[PDB]
Amino acid sequence: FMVKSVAERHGLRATFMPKPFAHLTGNGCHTHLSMWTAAGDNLFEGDGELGLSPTAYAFLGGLIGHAKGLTAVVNPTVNSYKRLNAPVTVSGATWSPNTITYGGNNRTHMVRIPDAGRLELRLPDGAANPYLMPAAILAAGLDGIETQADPGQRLDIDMYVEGHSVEAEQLPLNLLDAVRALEADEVLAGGLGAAAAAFAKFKRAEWADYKSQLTEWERRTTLDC
Amino acid sequence: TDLASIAREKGIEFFLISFTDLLGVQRAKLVPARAIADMAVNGAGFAGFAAWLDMSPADADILAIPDPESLIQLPWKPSVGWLAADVHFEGRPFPKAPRVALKSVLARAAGKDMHLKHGVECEFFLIQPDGSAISDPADTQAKPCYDQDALMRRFDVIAEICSYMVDLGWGPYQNDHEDANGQFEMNWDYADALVTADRHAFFK
Ligand SMILES: Nc1ncnc2c1ncn2[C@@H]1O[C@H](COP(=O)(O)OP(=O)(O)NP(=O)(O)O)[C@@H](O)[C@H]1O
Ligand SMILES: C[S@](=N)(=O)CC[C@H](N)C(=O)O
Ligand SMILES: [Mg+2]
Ligand SMILES: [Mg+2]
Ligand SMILES: [Mg+2]
Q1: Which of A31, B75, B90, B171 is buried most, with the most CB atoms less than 10 Å from its CB?
Q2: Dist CA B120 CA A112 (whole Å)
Q3: Number of domains chain A contains
Q4: CA proximity to B86, closest of B124, B143, B46
Q5: Which of B41, B47, B6, B3 is nearest to B27 (CA)?
């Protein structure tokens, strides 16, 4: 609200749209995450790989496990899916996640470990709801901690270059598929309560509206069929 | 051959006595039939430096001696006869002139009983007269090669030229739209290298 308001006062306009230009990097909203006790200790701080604790990695396990449904919430628009799995931009990289994977200090994954004691979830975009996003992430993380979820193996590769080199699960490719995953995800749907079903209904309505819009690409490439 | 008689028989009123310079530019004099007998023997005079031949303004005239066997009545304007010519300078064939240079190479090969024959694939685009765009705004698809639609959209131009090649005896056998939008190709039988070279020059 502040950015949009001040931009206007300067005769400019601000947009948090996930992918406002087809050939340029999109708007992310990465969240750096840590879990603390009331006494002021960071539970993610640890002696495991990269300065992380088993609690941190179980939380990551929740993120990985629930990634499909989580995508619906933190990538909540049709347009979100043009930021994810995007073709290479003029600057040489999209910098957004393509796959359900994590690396170290490595910006080509769904999750990056930027430094000891925290996780960076790089999945969300500028459309992500400021409340549903932490809520959805937390629900997924808590369940990871409760089930001692295994996040799998860290990938120290450039996933844009060497995604083919490894077997990795792709993120949902469009809003409708992400929403279906949300609805089928009990932990997530139950963690968000009635907000999840309400959200899903709205997003389905948006999809039905979008999927009927004729595009210029279609006209150009189909008129002469 | 007797060019004056042919002129009278076939109703040719003018001849283009034509030569190709180093840069490929067709240079010609348009001469009325009444003057062809003289020109065919002595050649048409030009200031060589004014064409791409690498001469001097101070040099004597080159003389373009037409090859009567190359005669072509312009099929779109049959009152005009086109002739390919060899540039002569100081009483000898001029070695800087493309056609003369080819004839020399050919003569060496021929002295060894080896005769080059070739065919040419002279791809071209059809574009707007101002050169801004291709002639056909509906020719847009990513793989346009051999496109039936775009080919037939220019049927009149292509068919006309092909039929001229039929009448001239070049043995044309196919035409199509090529791989770039706006691009075309018209093929005809290979021949002795000099024949093909002359036809190449006329074709363009
Ligand atoms: N023995 C030969 N010597 C010289 N030229 C020949 C000979 N036989 C055929 N040709 C000529 O070779 C040319 C063939 O060109 P074309 O029909 O366009 O075939 P292509 O080169 O396989 N086509 P493209 O896909 O455009 O490269 C014609 O001009 C033929 O007449
Ligand atoms: C990696 S970065 N240089 O922080 C860019 C992130 C990118 N805008 C994104 O879509 O997340
Ligand atoms: Mg970041
Ligand atoms: Mg060809
Ligand atoms: Mg070709």
Answers
A1: A31
A2: 60
A3: 1
A4: B46
A5: B47
B116 alpha carbon, closest ligand:
1
Query: Which residues have a beta carbon within 5 Å of ligand 5, which is an ion?
Result: B 185
The residue count of chain B comes to: 204
To one decimal, the resolution in angstroms is 2.3
- Rounded CA-CA distance B84/B87 in Å is 10
Q: Within chain B, what is the greatest distance between any pair of CA atoms?
A: 56
A178: domain CATH number is 3.30.590.10
Q: How many CB atoms lie within 10 A of CB B120?
A: 13
Say whether B149 and A224 touch across the interface (CB within 8 A).
yes
Query: Is A148 a member of any domain?
Result: yes
A9 touches chain B (CB under 8 A): no
- Quick check: is A220 in a domain? no
d(CA B188, CA B132) in angstroms, rounded, equals 30
Do residues B12 and B6 lie in contact, with contact meaning Cβ atoms separated by under 8 Å?
yes
Find out whether B123 is annotated in a ligand binding site.
yes
Ligand nearest to the CA of A97: 2
**Residue A223 domain flag:** no
In A26-158, which ranges are E strands? Answer: 31-33, 111-112, 119-121
Q: State the method.
A: X-ray
Closest CA to A19 of A82, A68, A67, A113: A82
Decide if A120 contacts A114 (C-beta within 8 A): yes
Residues in chain A: 225
> What residue has token string 């708007």?
A27
B136, B139, B140, best to mutate vs chain A, most A CBs in 10 Å: B140
Which atom in ligand 1 lies closest to the alpha carbon of residue B174?
17
Closest CA to A71 of A111, A14, A103: A111
Is A18 inside any structural domain? yes
State the number of CA atoms in the 13 A half-sphere of B186 facing the CB.
23
- Give the end-to-end CA distance of chain B in Å, rounded to a whole number: 26
